Symmetry: C2
Subunit: 121 residues, 2 copies
């Protein structure tokens, strides 16, 4: 189901951001966009993730919406709080587009990942 795919991915994503952000790049493909200008593909997305120096990253997910979208994809909207380097929690919204990976059944990859802190808006 789209909500199970969505909520399970969100759990995996923010857990990996805390445990091993150097492995976050495994979610993305050649044409993935990570968003400030967008960076594309695993190599550049990995470099951008590493440049953000994620350390002891704590997350409180307040709500997840996930719906079936174009070409068997899943669109996910996350609302929550994120802390980095033991600084205060900051509210954010995050939009993901999950797309079928195309070579393994029920496997998805992250086609779009758009994050914005609400205090910066």
């Amino acid at each position: 189901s789209p909500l199970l795919v969505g909520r399970e991915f969100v759990r995996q994503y923010y857990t990996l951001l805390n445990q091993a952000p150097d492995m976050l790049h495994r979610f993305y493909g050649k044409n993935s966009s990570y968003v400030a200008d967008a960076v594309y593909g695993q190599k550049e997305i990995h470099r951008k993730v590493m440049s953000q120096n994620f350390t002891n990253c704590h997350t409180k997910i307040r709500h997840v919406d996930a719906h079936a979208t174009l070409n068997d994809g899943v669109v996910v909207q996350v609302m929550g709080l994120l802390s980095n380097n033991n600084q205060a929690l900051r509210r954010f919204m995050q939009t993901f587009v999950l797309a079928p990976e195309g070579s393994v059944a029920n496997k998805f990859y992250v086609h779009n990942d758009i994050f914005r802190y609400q205090d910066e808006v």
Copy 2:
């Protein structure tokens, strides 16, 4: 006669958002024209409330929300190309309905050619945070 290069996803998103919120204030009874049979729609609410699917149910949900004299302050719009010529839009702003409180919201759209809205996810921050 002039032919112009197709607009970038960012200005497709920005133009869509300007049109959507102009219509929400001017004629909310016309908002359903953006949606199709497989489109998803959710605009906050607490039982967070569940989404409705398809044009007929979207029109009825929009009419039940009684949008009148809507005021919107769009603080940020992000938009990027997505699957099969689509555009994913992230919107952050403030919305006041019927001269009530200006409420912060977080919204996502998925637009697809013929652009129409495939997904519309809207949530008020005050129904999710605190």
